[PDB]
Design a protein around this ligand. Structure first.
Ligand SMILES: *[C@@H]1O[C@H](CO[C@@H]2O[C@@H](C)[C@@H](O)[C@@H](O)[C@@H]2O)[C@@H](O[C@@H]2O[C@H](CO)[C@@H](O[C@@H]3O[C@H](CO)[C@@H](O)[C@H](O)[C@@H]3O)[C@H](O)[C@H]2NC(C)=O)[C@H](O)[C@H]1NC(C)=O
Ligand SMILES: O=C(NCC(=O)N1[C@@H](c2cccc(O)c2)CC[C@H]1C(=O)O)[C@@H](S)Cc1ccc(O)cc1
Ligand SMILES: O=C(NCC(=O)N1[C@@H](c2cccc(O)c2)CC[C@H]1C(=O)O)[C@@H](S)Cc1ccc(O)cc1
Ligand SMILES: *[C@@H]1O[C@H](CO)[C@@H](O[C@@H]2O[C@H](CO)[C@@H](O)[C@H](O)[C@H]2NC(C)=O)[C@H](O)[C@H]1NC(C)=O
Ligand SMILES: *[C@@H]1O[C@H](CO)[C@@H](O[C@@H]2O[C@H](CO)[C@@H](O)[C@H](O)[C@H]2NC(C)=O)[C@H](O)[C@H]1NC(C)=O
Ligand SMILES: *[C@@H]1O[C@H](CO[C@@H]2O[C@@H](C)[C@@H](O)[C@@H](O)[C@@H]2O)[C@@H](O)[C@H](O)[C@H]1NC(C)=O
Ligand SMILES: *[C@@H]1O[C@H](CO)[C@@H](O)[C@H](O)[C@H]1NC(C)=O
Ligand SMILES: *[C@@H]1O[C@H](CO)[C@@H](O)[C@H](O)[C@H]1NC(C)=O
Ligand SMILES: OC[C@H]1O[C@@H](O)[C@@H](O)[C@@H](O)[C@@H]1O
Ligand SMILES: C[C@@H]1O[C@@H](O)[C@@H](O)[C@H](O)[C@@H]1O
Ligand SMILES: [Cl-]
Ligand SMILES: [Cl-]
Ligand SMILES: [Mg+2]
Ligand SMILES: [Mg+2]
Ligand SMILES: [Zn+2]
Ligand SMILES: [Zn+2]
Lengths: 607, 604
């Protein structure tokens, strides 16, 4: 560790802890920058050399965390919990948790190399027929636009096999090292550490109670969609009393169903709410999508994207043959100047929403860039994930799409409302079981309830239990289907997205009220509301300086996650789907839980 | 409720609570008897009228528990936790727990009535062909001795459909009413009350730690047995890397595997350690089996069965066209006089072990009959289930079988040691996953984690997770396969049996040491050891007066459940099974977790 980065001496008291944090800040920024920079160089340009540099930067960060971490524990171990400065205790608590820096050097290197290798495997995996398809864009477009049961099966099986199988031995080793590291910080396992970020003793119970309120909406959406799939694929491939085959919902993970809207839209005579075709016809490109997102932010009197963002960001998949991490992400370099998005942007309506989601991260970074580095995070991780989604809820309204030239015809009638709320349900309600189950799986792995011998057995138990889907080909424990989802090998927690999908409707309700809007919640558009902007800004500028329950109370008037705003938003389609399913004699659920579809005749040769 | 059973006036202090407890347990003695008496009349003669009277008795019991529980909180609710007397603290907290008495009257009627109907459905269900077969003895005998895949399937599917499907709507109603009752006592759900019996903050974690030490033994036994089934039935019906079809292990629930011993016995040249054929050749009957078990108890200077036991017990299935609950059980009438067994006894070796198990209960009853009622229980429920099994461990040794004329003396060689420990593994190790998982299922139902919409989904998840078996025909949520196991509709907790199967080896080691034995633990016979009997008598007389942790430490030197004795008992066959599986290149476990066998051609 360079001497400029090493901790000096401080009194064993709060006024030294305060200078401890200021000195830490000075050094942490440099260490965070070199770490983020090395990660950027690798993720935009996957090479063995760039992985080596990233691993050395990770080792430097561990060295730093150990020195300041053990200094913080040498002096302030019994006094940091009683400091009068609230932000200072949050700063100290972060610095003192060592994580992977608890591992001996040899195990730190093993851990860093596992992360790099898992990232390379996921983001360079390919499905081959000579020619070979990548996940983004090749397989993504197949899952989204093909309606050939056999072609979709080929992409689904090929992807899950290519990505999952080689990751499994690495993921087992990572899990053991991660647990070893956080056990030295006092946590029973890594999942307990991840859950502690929400500072709620009843977190898991709170989430289950939320999901109990939301599940009836999912069950009815599921039964309605299953019926539409049955009319296209037939009784051989769709069981009206069984799980839906996991490759038929428009998405590799069946996590968002927006791409099958054309098959489920109840009133096709109304305006076409999937504006992808109009974007193509009009010649939209990636940079236009980002400029339109930015202008919504500035319409609220939030910050534009700085020059450093436009000069440094990767907004399209490189055409020079480089391998890149294509999963969309937003980057804070912790120098208060450099902020970037990395996205292999495609010209579609759902990608326009993803652009807003990522730019919402950037807006957060810009608003809290002047806080201490330890407080440059969301009030909780679900806050960070919800910011851009909240704006995108306004952007997706038919009225707003008309304003930006993507929907010529504009209607206000009950059929058009049902169409729109059904499309939004395919995006927001269909995701809820998946956003809930992923970390239930990983929590069980981290705790040891799910050993390697049950990785896939327990994954598919949860997939069927919550999503009501089944794998379209047989799987066994050689397969590692959880590994075929970006966040698992890239070790990004997932429960934040279930929290986000609830929270964003709480935010939307509050911002719409602040904007003076007095119509139906799902027709609200906060575009150009500077009052809504100022309320959102107060949240963003707080970072993690205050408990999220208090930040939420100031914003929405409640100190807890609450499903009622989401339920209110969807109320009309919730009632309509329930009526439709009853009239059609649907079975809610999948009581034939053991059913799987047969294989296509002449599979996989027809491909 | 009779005035003489309603509670009197008592001071609000520990001295008054001492008189309170005495007056409670003198009046409880009379109420319990009339409940047990009416249950007995029903289970040995299932009719609507005996159901009516058993329910009248249950309502009266709930009236009694109400009156005395409400008085107990009225007087002592804020002070009893501070009594110096630990036994009195035990009694009062119990009396303060009302259970189904917390229900309003109309719900009490409904709850009492669901129990009667679930019991009738399970014990009268039949499988009819294309004559009708009953579970005991007909289907039991088919599962134990048929080696026809299709016949075993017909019996397995027939039974699970006939019992499970009609029970499901009733079990849902029962679950809801049971949870409503015990929430009023402060339990999050009925499962939490059941678990509270073990007075351990870390019960579930401790069980999981026990199972982690036992699972390698089960996995090796499983893979060895799967290989033997593959040879018999073929690659069509057995997947060497997948779960075993659930009907092929000699038992309707695949819960113990001793009945396929003759298919997996490695050294069939050696003496047949299944002495069933000798029992029949010699003319054994139910009454002989009970007299032989009795004499083991008295050989230890424990009590004989009293005249009331022999006159009142039902030791054979009645042949007078009558319907009975055939599941074996042992009855305490809480009058210090009447103790009985109800068993549809068959002349087989595993039934001789079941006879000892049931007589274990009776011996317990006899040794604590003078205690005040609230203590007339095992230190915990697993203690009660373990007593007879411990003696049966001695009875099953080839040396003891030789003493009682059921085995021509065998040689103390290695092939006979392996043969024996394998047969015992089929009976004891194979049970461990099942004993563990049944109440995992039931706890999730009570907690709400498992709604009716996932009863069968979650049952088969657990059956595959723990036992590594699969249903031999497709199942869906119309089926209620948990309902096809006696203890579910008859609402008898199951974790006691996992506890018992670990505890009995701790008891066995303690008693063998106390007897002076010094050979291998699995060759010990405590027959006629009056010192062993004396140390066991102490446990039985303690009832539930002292915490089971203290009773246990007095007997075995340790205050907690421990798998080491079980591991020591089986050590030699654990090593041998490991070697056999490596030689055959077995995969341990069932990584093809999705696999199910195909149907037989033109079945049924
Ligand atoms: C689409 O249309 C709906 C429905 O409009 C209402 O019903 C129609 C059948 C006609 O009768 C319309 O004249 C009628 O407004 C619109 O929702 C409605 O918006 C208005 C605001 O413009 C709401 O009125 C307000 O209501 C509150 C009480 O909550 C008062 O405090 C306000 O002063 C004001 O009167 C009205 O409640 C609301 N109706 C419903 C059912 O939500 C909607 O605005 C419109 N959308 C677009 C994009 O044009
Ligand atoms: O979350 C991230 N993008 C979005 C995203 O992935 N999702 C969320 C979504 C997707 C699209 C539109 C939305 O309105 C929201 C929900 C689903 C979930 C999903 O797609 O699975 C990056 S910012 C997080 C990261 C990535 C790499 C890292 O190394 C570190 C962090
Ligand atoms: O346990 C009881 N018999 C034995 C028994 O069932 N088993 C235990 C066993 C079976 C055979 C031999 C043994 O060494 C032990 C373990 C499995 C388990 C099983 O067979 O599933 C009555 S005492 C239980 C009851 C009956 C009716 C009631 O109303 C209340 C309780
Ligand atoms: C991707 O990373 C590689 C390194 O892995 C870069 O290759 C270097 O390119 C520079 C040019 O600036 C050369 O001087 C070095 O010799 C190269 N190093 C190696 C090891 O080949 C490459 O430039 C990067 N690509 C992009 C577009 O940034
Ligand atoms: C069967 O033989 C074994 C040894 O082959 C006997 O075990 C020995 O028992 C004596 C005491 O009787 C001990 O001193 C030895 O240490 C034991 N040896 C082993 C290897 O355990 C066993 O007692 C014999 N049992 C019978 C019933 O004959
Ligand atoms: C449940 O199962 C019943 C019994 O048949 C089983 O399911 C059918 C579909 C076949 O696969 C058969 O081999 C199985 O044994 C069916 O009658 C019933 O329709 C099934 N579905 C429901 C909702 O109960
Ligand atoms: C798992 O499935 C694959 C392909 O279906 C197969 O090659 C493999 O043998 C199966 N079993 C195991 C144990 O891997
Ligand atoms: C069985 O019960 C019925 C009605 O309860 C009664 O009439 C009959 O005598 C009983 N049979 C025996 C054998 O006790
Ligand atoms: O050697 C193990 C044991 O075997 C038997 C006797 O020989 C004992 O004295 C000894 O404890
Ligand atoms: C049955 C006997 O048990 C003991 C061993 O010392 C002998 O070699 C033999 O295995
Ligand atoms: Cl998170
Ligand atoms: Cl129990
Ligand atoms: Mg799309
Ligand atoms: Mg048996
Ligand atoms: Zn994000
Ligand atoms: Zn018993």
């Amino acid at each position: 560790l360079d001497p400029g980065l090493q901790p000096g001496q401080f009194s064993a008291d709060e006024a030294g802890a305060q200078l401890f944090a200021q000195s830490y800040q000075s050094s942490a920024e440099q260490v965070l920058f070199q770490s983020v920079a090395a990660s950027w160089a690798h993720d935009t340009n996957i090479t063995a050399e760039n992985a080596r540099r990233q691993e050395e930067a990770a080792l430097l960060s561990q060295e730093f965390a150990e020195a300041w971490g053990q200094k913080a524990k040498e002096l302030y171990e019994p006094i940091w919990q009683q400091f009068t400065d609230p932000q200072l205790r949050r700063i100290i608590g972060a610095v003192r948790t060592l994580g992977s820096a608890n591992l001996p050097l040899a195990k730190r290197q093993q851990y860093n190399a596992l992360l790099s290798q898992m990232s390379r495997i996921y983001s360079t995996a390919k499905v081959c027929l000579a020619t070979c398809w990548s996940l983004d864009p090749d397989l993504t477009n197949i899952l989204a636009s093909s309606r050939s049961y056999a072609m979709l099966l080929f992409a689904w099986e090929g992807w899950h096999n290519a990505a999952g199988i080689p990751l499994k031995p690495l993921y087992e080793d990572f899990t053991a090292l991660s647990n070893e590291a956080y056990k030295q910080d006092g946590f029973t396992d890594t999942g307990a550490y991840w859950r502690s970020w929400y500072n709620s003793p009843t977190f898991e119970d709170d989430l289950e109670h939320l999901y109990q309120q939301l599940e009836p909406l999912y069950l009815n959406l599921h039964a309605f969609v299953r019926r539409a799939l049955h009319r296209r694929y037939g009784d051989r491939y769709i069981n009206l009393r069984g799980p839906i085959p996991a490759h038929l919902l428009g998405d590799m993970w069946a996590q968002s169903w927006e791409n099958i809207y054309d098959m489920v839209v109840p009133f096709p005579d109304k305006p076409n709410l999937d504006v992808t075709s109009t974007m193509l016809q009009q010649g939209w490109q990636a940079t236009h999508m980002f400029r339109v997102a930015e202008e919504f932010f500035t319409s609220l009197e939030l910050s534009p994207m700085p020059p450093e963002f436009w000069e440094g960001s990767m907004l399209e998949k490189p055409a020079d043959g480089r391998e890149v991490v294509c999963h969309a992400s937003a980057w804070d370099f912790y120098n208060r100047k450099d902020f970037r998005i990395k996205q292999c942007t495609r010209v579609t309506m759902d990608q326009l929403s993803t652009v807003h989601h990522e730019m919402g991260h950037i807006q957060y970074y810009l608003q809290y860039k002047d806080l201490p580095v330890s407080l440059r995070r969301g009030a909780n991780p679900g806050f960070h994930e919800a910011i851009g989604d909240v704006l995108a809820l306004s952007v997706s309204t038919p009225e707003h799409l008309h304003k930006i030239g993507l929907l010529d015809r504009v209607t206000n009638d009950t059929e058009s409302d049902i169409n729109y709320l059904l499309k939004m349900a395919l995006e927001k309600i269909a995701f809820l079981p998946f956003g809930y189950l992923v970390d239930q799986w990983r929590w069980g792995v981290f705790s040891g309830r799910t050993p390697p011998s049950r990785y896939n057995f327990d994954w598919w138990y949860l997939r069927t239990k919550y999503q009501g889907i089944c794998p379209p080909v047989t799987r066994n424990e050689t397969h590692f289907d959880a590994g075929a989802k970006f966040h698992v090998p890239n070790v990004t927690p997932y429960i934040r997205y279930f929290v986000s999908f609830v929270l964003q409707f709480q935010f939307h309700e509050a911002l719409c009220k602040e904007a003076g809007y007095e119509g139906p919640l799902h027709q609200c558009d906060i575009y150009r509301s500077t009052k809504a902007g100022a309320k959102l800004r107060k949240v963003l500028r707080a970072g993690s300086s205050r408990p999220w329950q208090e930040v939420l109370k100031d914003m929405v008037g409640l100190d807890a996650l609450d499903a009622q705003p989401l339920l209110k938003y969807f109320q009309l389609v919730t009632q309509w789907l329930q009526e439709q399913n009853q009239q059609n004699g649907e079975v809610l659920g999948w009581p034939e839980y053991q059913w799987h579809p047969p294989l296509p005749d002449n599979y996989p040769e027809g491909i």
